[PDB]
Every structure is written in C-alpha cells, then in structure tokens.
C-alpha cells in the first residue's frame, strides 16, 4: 500500500504556517520518534483527490473545510472521532464546519475570513463603500499609487463583492437553488469589470503582484486573509485591517473557511495523525508554533483564542466573518469554484460579458445535480415503469425536457441495442452494490474510448437504464440510485467542459429537437 508506515507525511498550503507547523513536527519526533515531514505542494487541493483515490497521498492534508464533503464522499477520509473531553476544547461551530452526512471528517483548525488591508500612511481613512473607490483611486494615481489590488486568479477574493448585493452559492442547504446568475450576482462582477474597464484594476493581477504592490507601498488597499500579516510586518508599512467596504448599501460577504486536518483512508498511521492533531498541534503550544510564523486567523481551540481574540486584526476579521457565510462542504463546491475562478477571469480579460460568464458558471455549478436528477428519474422509471411524481425545482424545466428528449431518443438506442446490452449485461456479474462499483471502471472505459457526442452519452445512459431493469428484477432497487449517481459522475467527472460548452442540457433538448 502506498503510504509509508511509521512516519507522518503532512501537506498544507504555501500561504499557511508551514515552518511552524514543522516545528510542531520536530516536537513530536522528539516524543515518539516519528519523524514529520511537512509539505507544500502546488494545487494541493486538485491533487489530493487524484493521488488519494489510488491510496497514495499525504498522512494529513489542510485545507478549509469546503473540499472536505468531496472528499469524503469520494471515501478519501477517516472518520475521526474525538472524545467529548476533546471536542469541547474547541468551538462547536468550527466543529458544525467538518461534520459531513452526520459523521465528523476532519479537525478544525482556524476560522479564516478576508478583510480589507489598508496602508494607514496612504489612507489614513479606509473607504466605507466600494461606490468610492474609483475617485480614489483617480487622487492616488495623481500620486503615483493606486487604490486597491487584490488577487484576480482565485474567486475567493472577488467572492465577497459578487455576494453583497444577493448572489449566492447553494441557497440555505438547497443544491437546486444557485444563485451565481441573479442580478445580485451581475451588479457585483459589472462593478469589478467596470474597475477594470476604467483602468483602477489590472486583470492580470495575481495573489504574488498584489501582495508585493501593497507591501512595496504601491497601492493603498488590500483584501486578504490573517495568512498574509507576517509579510506585511516584515515590509514595515504602516497597516489596518477592517471592515470589508459595502456595495449596494450593503455588506461584503465573504465565505468564511475553517482550515481543517484531515487524515487519509488510505494512512496506515490514522493513531499517529490523531495523536499529532490532537496532542500537539491542537494545543495552546502548537497553535502558538504556526501563528507566530503565519497567522492562522481565530482558532477553534477556546483557550489560546480567549488571548488572540484581544487582537483589533482579529476583532475585523471576525467582523468580516460575521457579515459572510460559513462555506458550504457538499461535494459541488470543487466544480462551483472551478465554474466561478473562470466566470471571474474571462469577465476582467474581456474575453465573456458578465452575462455570459456568470450564465456559463451557473450550468457548471449546476450540472452535477442537474445531469442526476435526469440520469436518476430516467433509470428509476425504466426500471419500475411509472414516472416520479415529485415536481422539479423552480429552475427544472430544462430537467423536464431533458428528461422528455432522453425517453423519446433513449426508446430507440435501449430496442435497437437491446440483444448486445443482454450480452454485455451477462458477462459482468452485477447483483448487487458491491458490483456497481466495478461498473464505473468498465463504463468510463468504454465511454471514454469512443468519441464525445450527445448519441454516445444516450447509449451509455441507456445501458444504465438497462441495468437498471434487470436490478429491479432480482429485488435489488435499491442499487438503482447507485448506478444512477455513478455513470453521472463518469459522465460529469470526463466531460465538464464539452458539457458547459453546449449549454448542458439545452443542447441536449436542442441536439435532438
Ligand atoms: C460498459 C457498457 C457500455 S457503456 C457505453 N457507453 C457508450 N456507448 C456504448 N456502446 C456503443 C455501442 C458505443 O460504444 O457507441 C457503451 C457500452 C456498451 C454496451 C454494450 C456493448 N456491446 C458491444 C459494445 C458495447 C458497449
Ligand atoms: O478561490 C477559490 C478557492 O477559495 C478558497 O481557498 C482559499 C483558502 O480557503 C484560503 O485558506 C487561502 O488559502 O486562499 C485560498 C484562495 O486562493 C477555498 O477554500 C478553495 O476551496 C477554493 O478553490
Ligand atoms: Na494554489
């Protein structure tokens, strides 16, 4: 098995603590002997899903809490199960950020909300409104400065200003209700697109130039997290940190992460993580250890936060975290990131109105849901024969045509196929949930093998449907949705973007109108 045994591999983002949280790892090595190997890899967050499903990976992985439901789903990580003498040294709300389908995922670090960073030398009196911000930065340019630079690459960052004015994530959580698409939503990315337009922003700012332009004393604003303050301590420029500024009225909302450890299913040193995590690191010493060297924000360990918590820089992030939202942990929040970073980078570039990038985000943060819901109701009324009389959401027509289009198309591929499904069918042993598993390997195989077309996407479908029929047949209805959940995760996980480039569904209707 590819994780090595009697040693503690620990992965955490280049952002974060990281020599500090060796520290803690030359404190455990002392004790027991383990040696801690701490690292930071690029793009952690897309490469732990990859590595772990193949049993490889970090013993321990940090991240916020928001990849953790996906992670989790996947079975990429251990239950932890702390003892009620533990669990009440930290704040239950970080706990409520790591419990996913009832079952505790992770150990919550910090709570980590952005805040507006200001040089007090520049700016002596931070704006109150985003609405200011252009006239400004007109009277530093004036000065050879700017306004405000923040990272442009990653949405978390503009998040905050899209959210103010009504748009929303996943409405609370209801999966069917997104809100990236609604006027809210627009008025907050126009105004960051109109900042650009009007030369106060540069589109090709990243987490890198912004950070080196604030603490170079180029620019007189920043948006960033707890993380950042080391550096700017060291750069000597004189800094607050408040209150986000409103639009609209109203106030930034930024989406508020726990950082959270969690330890991989595939680890065969699950004792030594827990005893790492809870032990020394979780504790007024080793939180001291990582914050000294980057701010972890407010800890979820009561006792040393009671001393940060008298920190102003604290006080305004917890400010900021109170007029934001806790993120979502569902396992969609990998795709509604990856579907908003590229809504936010194409509306700076120019190369997608506003409209059309938030309309294209909105179908890849939906799909998942989407593309099940159909996958779902078509193999389950296959399967039994009568149709689910629930009503789709208020955003469901397209599910109800979709559905409408894959039963006229559907008809035909399962007749004319049906002699070589009953010959494929017999070959697998499929009779019960432990088979289906195997499937997904089979069907993205052969999937993938051929090309990419709305016909092929029907026949695999319809092979599903197939299955399906004969599962309710051996009393085994209860694999259907299974299935159902993995050929539209073959389906999603190896077509994304093919997908959000036909207008998901829509095209489908529209392919075989
Ligand atoms: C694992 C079962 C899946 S998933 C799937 N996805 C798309 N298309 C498929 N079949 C067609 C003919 C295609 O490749 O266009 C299949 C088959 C499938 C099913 C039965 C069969 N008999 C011979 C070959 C074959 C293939
Ligand atoms: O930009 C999307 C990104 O946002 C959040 O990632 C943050 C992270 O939480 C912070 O700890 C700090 O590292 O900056 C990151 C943004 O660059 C989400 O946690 C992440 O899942 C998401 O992809
Ligand atoms: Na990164």
């Given at each position: 098995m590819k994780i090595e045994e009697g040693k503690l591999v620990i992965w955490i983002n280049g952002?974060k603590?990281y020599?500090?949280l060796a520290?803690v790892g030359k404190?455990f090595e002392?004790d027991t002997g383990i040696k801690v190997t701490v690292e930071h890899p690029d793009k952690l967050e897309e490469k732990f899903p990859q590595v772990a499903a193949t049993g490889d990976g970090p013993d321990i992985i940090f991240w916020?809490?928001?990849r953790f439901g996906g992670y989790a789903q996947s079975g990429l990580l251990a239950e932890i199960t702390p003892?009620?003498?533990?669990?009440?040294?930290?704040?239950?709300?970080?706990?409520?950020?790591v419990?996913?389908?009832?079952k505790l995922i992770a150990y919550?670090i910090?709570?980590?909300?952005?805040?507006?960073?200001?040089?007090?030398?520049?700016?002596?009196?931070?704006?109150?409104?985003?609405?200011?911000?252009?006239?400004?930065?007109?009277?530093?340019?004036?000065?050879?400065?700017?306004?405000?630079?923040?990272?442009?690459?990653?949405?978390?960052?503009?998040?905050?200003?899209?959210?103010?004015?009504?748009?929303?994530?996943?409405?609370?959580?209801?999966?069917?209700?997104?809100?990236?698409?609604?006027?809210?939503?627009?008025?907050?990315?126009?105004?960051?697109?109109?900042?650009?337009?009007?030369?106060?922003?540069?589109?090709?700012?990243?987490?890198?130039?912004?950070?080196?332009?604030?603490?170079?004393?180029?620019?007189?604003?920043?948006?960033?997290?707890?993380?950042?303050?080391?550096?700017?301590?060291?750069?000597?420029?004189?800094?607050?940190?408040?209150?986000?500024?409103?639009?609209?009225?109203?106030?930034?909302?930024?989406?508020?992460?726990?950082?959270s450890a969690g330890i991989n299913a595939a680890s065969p040193n699950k004792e030594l993580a827990k005893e790492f995590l809870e032990n020394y690191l979780?504790?007024?010493?080793?939180?001291?250890?990582?914050?000294?060297?980057?701010?972890?924000?407010?800890?979820?360990?009561?006792?040393?936060?009671?001393?940060?918590?008298?920190?102003?820089?604290?006080?305004?992030?917890?400010?900021?975290?109170?007029?934001?939202?806790?993120?979502?942990?569902?396992?969609?929040?990998?795709?509604?990131?990856?579907?908003?970073?590229?809504?936010?980078?194409?509306?700076?570039?120019?190369?997608?109105?506003?409209?059309?990038?938030?309309?294209?985000?909105?179908?890849?943060?939906?799909?998942?849901?989407?593309?099940?819901?159909?996958?779902?109701?078509?193999?389950?009324?296959?399967?039994?024969?009568?149709?689910?009389?629930?009503?789709?959401?208020?955003?469901?027509?397209?599910?109800?045509?979709?559905?409408?289009?894959?039963?006229?198309?559907?008809?035909?591929?399962?007749?004319?196929?049906?002699?070589?499904?009953?010959?494929?069918?017999?070959?697998?042993?499929?009779?019960?949930?432990?088979?289906?598993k195997?499937?997904?390997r089979?069907?993205?195989?052969?999937?993938?093998?051929?090309?990419?077309?709305?016909?092929?996407?029907?026949?695999?479908?319809?092979?599903?449907?197939?299955?399906?029929?004969?599962?309710?047949?051996?009393?085994?209805?209860?694999?259907?949705?299974?299935?159902?959940?993995?050929?539209?995760?073959?389906?999603?996980?190896?077509?994304?973007?093919?997908?959000?480039?036909?207008?998901?569904?829509?095209?489908?209707?529209?392919?075989?109108?």
């Open positions: 952002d603590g020599n500090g520290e404190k002392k916020a809490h928001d003892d009620k003498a533990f669990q009440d040294k930290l704040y239950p709300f970080t706990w409520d950020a419990r996913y389908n009832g919550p910090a709570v980590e909300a952005l805040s507006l960073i200001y040089n007090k030398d520049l700016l002596p009196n931070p704006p109150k409104t985003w609405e200011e911000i252009p006239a400004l930065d007109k009277e530093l340019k004036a000065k050879g400065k700017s306004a405000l630079m923040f990272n442009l690459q990653e949405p978390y960052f503009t998040w905050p200003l899209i959210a103010a004015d009504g748009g929303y994530a996943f409405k609370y959580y209801d999966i069917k209700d997104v809100g990236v698409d609604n006027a809210g939503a627009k008025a907050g990315l126009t105004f960051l697109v109109d900042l650009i337009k009007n030369k106060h922003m540069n589109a090709d700012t990243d987490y890198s130039i912004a950070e080196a332009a604030f603490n170079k004393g180029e620019t007189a604003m920043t948006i960033n997290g707890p993380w950042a303050w080391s550096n700017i301590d060291t750069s000597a420029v004189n800094y607050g940190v408040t209150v986000l500024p409103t639009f609209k009225g109203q106030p930034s909302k930024p989406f508020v992460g726990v950082l979780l504790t007024d010493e080793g939180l001291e250890a990582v914050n000294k060297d980057k701010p972890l924000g407010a800890v979820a360990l009561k006792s040393y936060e009671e001393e940060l918590a008298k920190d102003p820089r604290i006080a305004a992030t917890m400010e900021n975290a109170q007029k934001g939202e806790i993120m979502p942990n569902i396992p969609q929040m990998s795709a509604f990131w990856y579907a908003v970073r590229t809504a936010v980078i194409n509306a700076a570039s120019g190369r997608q109105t506003v409209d059309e990038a938030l309309k294209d985000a909105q179908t890849g943060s939906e799909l998942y849901r989407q593309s099940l819901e159909i996958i779902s109701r078509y193999l389950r009324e296959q399967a039994t024969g009568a149709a689910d009389t629930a009503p789709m959401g208020a955003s469901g027509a397209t599910s109800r045509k979709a559905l409408e289009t894959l039963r006229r198309v559907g008809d035909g591929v399962q007749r004319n196929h049906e002699t070589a499904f009953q010959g494929m069918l017999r070959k697998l042993d499929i009779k019960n949930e432990d088979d289906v195997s499937l997904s089979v069907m993205i195989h052969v999937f993938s093998d051929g090309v990419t077309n709305w016909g092929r996407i029907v026949t695999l479908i319809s092979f599903g449907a197939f299955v399906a029929k004969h599962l309710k047949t051996i009393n085994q209805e209860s694999c259907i949705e299974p299935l159902a959940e993995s050929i539209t995760d073959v389906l999603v996980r190896t077509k994304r973007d093919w997908l959000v480039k036909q207008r998901g569904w829509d095209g489908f209707v529209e392919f075989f109108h």
